Write a protein that binds this ligand. Structure first.
Ligand SMILES: *[C@@H]1O[C@H](CO[C@@H]2O[C@@H](C)[C@@H](O)[C@@H](O)[C@@H]2O)[C@@H](O[C@@H]2O[C@H](CO)[C@@H](O)[C@H](O)[C@H]2NC(C)=O)[C@H](O[C@@H]2O[C@@H](C)[C@@H](O)[C@@H](O)[C@@H]2O)[C@H]1NC(C)=O
Ligand SMILES: *[C@@H]1O[C@H](CO)[C@@H](O[C@@H]2O[C@H](CO)[C@@H](O[C@@H]3O[C@H](CO)[C@@H](O)[C@H](O)[C@@H]3O)[C@H](O)[C@H]2NC(C)=O)[C@H](O)[C@H]1NC(C)=O
Ligand SMILES: *[C@@H]1O[C@H](CO)[C@@H](O[C@@H]2O[C@H](CO)[C@@H](O)[C@H](O)[C@H]2NC(C)=O)[C@H](O[C@@H]2O[C@@H](C)[C@@H](O)[C@@H](O)[C@@H]2O)[C@H]1NC(C)=O
Ligand SMILES: *[C@@H]1O[C@H](CO)[C@@H](O[C@@H]2O[C@H](CO)[C@@H](O)[C@H](O)[C@H]2NC(C)=O)[C@H](O)[C@H]1NC(C)=O
Ligand SMILES: *[C@@H]1O[C@H](CO)[C@@H](O[C@@H]2O[C@H](CO)[C@@H](O)[C@H](O)[C@H]2NC(C)=O)[C@H](O)[C@H]1NC(C)=O
Ligand SMILES: *[C@@H]1O[C@H](CO)[C@@H](O[C@@H]2O[C@H](CO)[C@@H](O)[C@H](O)[C@H]2NC(C)=O)[C@H](O)[C@H]1NC(C)=O
Ligand SMILES: *[C@@H]1O[C@H](CO)[C@@H](O[C@@H]2O[C@H](CO)[C@@H](O)[C@H](O)[C@H]2NC(C)=O)[C@H](O)[C@H]1NC(C)=O
Ligand SMILES: *[C@@H]1O[C@H](CO)[C@@H](O)[C@H](O)[C@H]1NC(C)=O
Ligand SMILES: *[C@@H]1O[C@H](CO)[C@@H](O)[C@H](O)[C@H]1NC(C)=O
Ligand SMILES: *[C@@H]1O[C@H](CO)[C@@H](O)[C@H](O)[C@H]1NC(C)=O
Length: 589
């Protein structure tokens, strides 16, 4: 009969990829059929897995006529229409996975009438309306997943009545704004509470502290208010706490230090105040994210003790004092973001000791001293932002040439010395921002070797000498800003090679000679500033062809007529401070 029933399933579904080709009526048994598994001396179908088969059409309710069917998966198909109340006919089902389908309408209340059901996954469907009251009466359910549906009812307290529940997954539903039922604290066996983006309102219940077996608490992306409960110290087995993007206030409880198994804490994007507790930092955390809060005081040195720490993101706070001296020495630190704080003192000497540091983001702080010499050997680095600090000294030779660095931002510091020839080694460099420093010397020829470079901003420095001829080799360059320097010499026909250049700013330098006619060849140039230089001769006629939002050729030695487009009252400020250009425009001189 199992074969005949499965033939009825086949006739009820669209099978464009012929996944059910093997479903042959002439077969003695259906056990060898695609997606079918049998058990017992009877060769009874016990499992059907038609996942990722590109099957389409309504749920095949006739499949429930299989007496011994214990596992059904139609995961990742185009199963559509409503889930029938006839699903209760599947009385032997232990696991049901209908995730990633096109199922619509209300959840059938008869799902709770399957006593054997342990796993229910309806994730990634279009189910809407209230969660049925029957769902409170599930006999043996351990996993309930309704993630990414259109459920628009309130979160029901009766879900707390499922004593056997180990995972409650209701994340990513447009639920009517609802408080977390305190009855959820009575789910003694619960290991996962996943309520991300569930339109939660009100305060986290103290009852949630009763969940001794909880491994993951996720209440992120909601409108939760009030304080993180000190009762959460009762979460003995918790490893992950996600409270990010809420409206939580008050201080981080020191009782979080009692959570020995805690490795991941993210309470970022809240209104938390007070200091980060030493007790929490004593826990050997893997990730601590407390960014975009109103936290103050020092970062406890105990955080450096963790052997598992790879991530610290505490940016956008009012934290003071120095970073821990041993930070990175005992941990595989990968991501460090302490930006927009009040941190001071030298950077820790061994941030990259374990050789895994990828992101060093410390902008808008009062960090001082020289870049640690160890960081010159940190080849793992991909993004470096030391901008808006009080750093001094030369940038270490190795630091310039780090191979995987895509962004090097040293803007607004007191950095001195020269860009080393080692910069040629920076194959991955796309953005180089060194503006507002005391850098000296000439740009190295090795800068031209950086084919991937898109931005070179080094304004407000003491750079000098002729631009390297290799600078033409920067075909991918979109921004070149060298204003407020002592750069000398002349531009060449090589500037034509800057095909993708949108901005050229060489203002307030000592440049001499004619502006090359090849300036017109730069099709996407929208910003040109050559002001405060000694550029001489006629303005290139080709400049008319360029569409420029900003043009400044002021305070130069330029002479002769303007192209007709540029000869306008609006462009007077662009050509002031040039004796030769006088009388090109009425009221210029
Ligand atoms: C439920 O899915 C049925 C199977 O269709 C295929 O899979 C869909 C997910 C979609 O990719 C579709 O393009 C596939 O053809 C639909 O049936 C059919 O509808 C299509 C037009 O969309 C038609 O060309 C087919 O001949 C027709 N086949 C069968 C066996 O009915 C259901 O569609 C609905 O009913 C149709 C008769 C038609 O009136 C259509 O407008 C309806 O949407 C799908 N039902 C729902 C509720 O979406
Ligand atoms: C109910 O929700 C929980 C929490 O989202 C789901 O649990 C978790 O499942 C994911 C995906 O399987 C796990 O992620 C990964 O880690 C493993 C290594 O252990 C790795 O191989 C994967 O590539 C992935 O990175 C996650 O660790 C796990 N978390 C917990 C706390 O258990 C659960 O699957 C959901 N159940 C249903 C039916 O929706
Ligand atoms: C979790 O289950 C407990 C046991 O059923 C609840 O406690 C009890 O409360 C009942 C009324 O809600 C009462 O009839 C029971 O006699 C009592 N049982 C025991 C052993 O205490 C508990 O409810 C809460 O705690 C009690 C003391 C009251 O303060 C109630 O207002 C609470 O809701 C359940 N917890 C939750 C959060 O529902
Ligand atoms: C969901 O099922 C579909 C259909 O089996 C999977 O789609 C295909 O992806 C594989 C691997 O990239 C390709 O070789 C096939 O050509 C694709 N087929 C179709 C019809 O798109 C899809 O990968 C599955 N998704 C998941 C997350 O498992
Ligand atoms: C809470 O859960 C219990 C246990 O699943 C539910 O209890 C039963 O109620 C159903 C239908 O009313 C009966 O068929 C069962 O025989 C009852 N079993 C037991 C062990 O009492 C109870 O209804 C649920 N309550 C809520 C509000 O959902
Ligand atoms: C970044 O550095 C620049 C240059 O030092 C700062 O800009 C100027 O502000 C100072 C006063 O603090 C003036 O005396 C200068 O004339 C300004 N220079 C220029 C070129 O505009 C800028 O304020 C700094 N930004 C931050 C956030 O610290
Ligand atoms: C081109 O650059 C010159 C020099 O920086 C600019 O000149 C001055 O204009 C500003 C704003 O009106 C005044 O505050 C300064 O006093 C002027 N300085 C001098 C030395 O004259 C000019 O405005 C810029 N023009 C454009 C179009 O950007
Ligand atoms: C499911 O809901 C989404 C979002 O409202 C919509 O874009 C999609 O077309 C819906 N699909 C079905 C089958 O109702
Ligand atoms: C945080 O939530 C707000 C809505 O309150 C949303 O606009 C924003 O994109 C979210 N940001 C992150 C990083 O989750
Ligand atoms: C370049 O840096 C980016 C991150 O900015 C990274 O994803 C990429 O893998 C790097 N590529 C190389 C070749 O280092």
């Amino acid at each position: 009969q199992d074969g005949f029933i499965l033939q009825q399933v086949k006739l009820s579904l669209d099978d464009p990829d012929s996944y059910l080709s093997s479903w042959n009526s002439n077969d003695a048994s259906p056990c060898r059929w695609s997606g079918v598994s049998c058990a017992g001396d009877f060769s009874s179908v016990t499992s059907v897995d038609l996942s990722s088969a590109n099957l389409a059409g309504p749920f095949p309710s006739v499949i429930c006529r299989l007496s011994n069917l214990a596992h059904l998966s139609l995961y990742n198909n185009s199963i559509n229409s409503t889930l029938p109340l006839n699903i209760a006919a599947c009385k032997s089902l232990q696991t049901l996975d209908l995730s990633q389908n096109l199922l619509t309408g209300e959840l059938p209340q008869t799902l709770a009438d399957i006593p054997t059901l342990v796993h229910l996954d309806l994730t990634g469907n279009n189910f809407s309306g209230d969660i049925p009251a029957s769902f409170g009466k599930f006999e043996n359910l351990e996993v309930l997943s309704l993630v990414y549906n259109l459920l628009d009812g309130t979160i029901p307290p009766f879900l707390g009545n499922i004593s056997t529940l180990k995972m409650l997954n209701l994340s990513y539903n447009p639920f009517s704004p609802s408080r977390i039922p305190p009855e959820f604290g009575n789910l003694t066996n619960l290991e996962v509470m996943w309520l991300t983006e569930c339109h939660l309102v009100g305060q986290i219940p103290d009852s949630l502290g009763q969940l001794s077996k909880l491994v993951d608490l996720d209440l992120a992306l909601n409108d939760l208010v009030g304080h993180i409960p000190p009762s959460l110290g009762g979460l003995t087995n918790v490893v992950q706490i996600e409270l990010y993007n809420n409206s939580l206030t008050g201080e981080i409880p020191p009782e979080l230090g009692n959570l020995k198994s805690l490795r991941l804490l993210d309470a970022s994007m809240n209104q938390l105040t007070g200091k980060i507790p030493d007790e929490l930092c004593r826990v050997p955390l893997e990730s601590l994210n407390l960014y975009e809060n109103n936290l103050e005081g020092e970062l406890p040195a105990s955080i450096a003790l963790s052997p598992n720490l790879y991530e610290i993101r505490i940016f956008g706070n009012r934290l003071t004092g120095g970073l821990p001296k041993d930070l990175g020495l005992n941990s595989p630190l990968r991501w460090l973001d302490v930006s927009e704080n009040e941190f001071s003192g030298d950077l820790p000497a061994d941030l990259c000791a374990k050789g895994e540091l990828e992101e060093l983001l410390i902008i808008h702080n009062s960090f001082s001293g020289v870049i640690p010499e160890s960081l010159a050997d940190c080849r793992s680095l991909t993004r470096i932002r030391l901008a808006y600090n009080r750093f001094s000294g030369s940038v270490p030779t190795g630091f310039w040439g780090l191979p995987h660095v895509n962004l090097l931002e040293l803007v607004n510091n007191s950095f001195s010395g020269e860009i080393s020839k080692s910069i040629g080694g920076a194959s991955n460099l796309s953005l180089l921002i060194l503006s507002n420093n005391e850098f000296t010397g000439s740009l190295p020829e090795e800068i031209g070797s950086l084919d991937n470079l898109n931005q070179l901003s080094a304004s407000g420095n003491k750079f000098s000498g002729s631009l390297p001829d290799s600078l033409m080799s920067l075909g991918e360059l979109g921004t070149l800003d060298l204003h407020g320097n002592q750069f000398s010499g002349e531009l060449t026909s090589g500037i034509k090679s800057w095909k993708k250049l949108n901005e050229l700013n060489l203002a307030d330098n000592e440049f001499t000679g004619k502006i090359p006619d090849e300036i017109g060849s730069l099709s996407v140039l929208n910003y040109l500033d050559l002001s405060g230089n000694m550029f001489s001769g006629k303005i290139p006629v080709s400049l008319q062809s360029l569409k420029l939002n900003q043009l400044n050729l002021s305070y130069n030695r330029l002479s002769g007529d303007l192209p007709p487009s540029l000869a306008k009252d609006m462009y007077k400020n662009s050509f002031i401070g040039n004796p030769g250009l006088c009388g090109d425009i009425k009221g210029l001189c």
